[PDB]
């Protein structure tokens, strides 16, 4: 396969508004929401059909209960953080955890927490220790590091249990996740050269411009990879054209094992 990843995100808000939840949790295979839960519905529900079709209600019943507990754990941690920061008002607590299974079989794992959208605590599954970005986070580091067993716990889950899930989820959405739709690439004038690409999945694509065989990475203006809405993405990458001297420009596009070159005349 290509490089796949599994992620769970948790979001907590201190004093939300009327409609806003206080707790949200979403899971992602690669770039696909697969599971969702919030403090309103109070239910973990699938977000990909191929998730619903292969995970039985037992699975969703068990994890509904677990997030309810986690929702309250996440509120408790937030209250604690915000008291140590001496912060009034509404504030944001974020958690992300997951793993990647690279093409050559090697794997990675990560776990980190955020406060008001900044880094707070970044786990190191190899030295088995937390990294604190300040002294509120230093306090939580020593509390968590004192319970050596819960660190060995997170290591095993990141390196074996996260990956074990990811493999299972890949077979569940094999048709979705392992398909390859190559991109349609053109060139347009706007005086700049625009190399536009659309209609492709997976969303990992490199698009550069080259002058006569040498790249110009500081002169390239890169576009962002945007969702189209039908399952595919589209991106672009421009360069400014020299009015005083001609030049052999050539757009290059790498994607899912195939590299293409568009020479402009």
């Amino acid at each position, epitope marked *: 396969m290509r490089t796949h990843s599994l992620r769970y995100f948790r979001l907590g808000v201190s004093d939300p508004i009327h409609g806003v939840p206080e707790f949200i949790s979403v899971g992602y295979v690669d770039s696909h929401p697969i599971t969702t839960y919030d403090s309103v519905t109070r239910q973990k529900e699938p977000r990909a059909p191929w998730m619903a079709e292969n995970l039985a209600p037992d*699975h969703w*019943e*068990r*994890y509904t*209960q*677990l997030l*309810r*507990g*986690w*929702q*309250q*754990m996440f509120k408790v941690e937030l209250k604690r953080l915000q008291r140590h920061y001496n912060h009034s008002g509404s504030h944001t607590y974020q958690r992300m955890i997951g793993c990647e299974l690279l093409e050559d079989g090697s794997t990675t794992g990560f776990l980190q927490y955020a406060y008001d959208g900044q880094d707070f605590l970044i786990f190191n599954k190899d030295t088995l220790s937390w990294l604190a970005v300040d002294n509120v986070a230093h306090t939580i580091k020593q509390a968590w590091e004192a*319970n050596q*067993h*819960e660190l*060995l*716990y*997170q*290591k*095993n*889950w990141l390196e*074996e*249990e996260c990956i*074990a*899930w990811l493999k299972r989820f890949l077979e569940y959405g094999k048709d979705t996740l392992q398909r390859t739709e190559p991109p349609l690439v053109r060139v347009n004038r706007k005086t700049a050269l625009f190399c536009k690409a659309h209609g492709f999945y997976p969303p990992e694509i490199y698009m550069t411009w080259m002058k006569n065989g040498e790249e110009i990475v500081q002169e390239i203006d890169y576009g962002d990879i945007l969702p189209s809405g039908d399952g595919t993405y589209q991106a672009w990458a421009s360069i400014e054209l020299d009015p005083q001297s001609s030049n052999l420009y050539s757009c290059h596009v790498e994607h899912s094992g195939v590299h293409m070159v568009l020479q402009v005349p």
Partner: antibody
Amino acid sequence: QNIDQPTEMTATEGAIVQINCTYQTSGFNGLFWYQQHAGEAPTFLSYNVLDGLEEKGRFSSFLSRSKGYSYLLLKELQMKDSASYLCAVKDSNYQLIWGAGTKLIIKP
Amino acid sequence: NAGVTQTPKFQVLKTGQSMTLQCAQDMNHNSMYWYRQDPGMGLRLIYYSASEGTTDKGEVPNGYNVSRLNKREFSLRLESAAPSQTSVYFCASSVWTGEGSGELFFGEGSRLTVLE
């Protein structure tokens, strides 16, 4: 899911005894040992999650995830260690699966 | 520092009686459980309560029910007692469910015997 530990073991006071616990489970999130004296409530003994051997006093617990098997090792046996030792495995969904226990019986 | 307090320590019951066992924890835990211990079997969950505000069935819930009264109290009820429900029932508590090294603190026990 399935856990197996032997029903009872007899050893002699001041010796060494090794209580095996094999398991086949859906996932794996850690292994516990619980001590339960006859008539009384189980208390927590040990917790293993990565491979290797963990000493805690004169008790030691081991784990090989690959072979899917833990053992509890009691050194210099005394009479007060005559209890049941229950093995417990946390599965992929964090459900504890319990073995039947092992009645440890010490000859004085 | 009382720990897990369950009552009664002993009960005798006639087929069809109602019965409610009590459990409290003074440890400010969040997850509470009800197990039953039988000869030859490993412990078996009856019901559990992951957090004050939720409950759910365990492995063998038929003929039981529970109610999370508050953060400290988790009670087991037997609707229509039955000779098969003769067992020792342990209450248990842990700080959180889902935490991997969080162990279970157990109560003294309840020895129940349903007779004809």
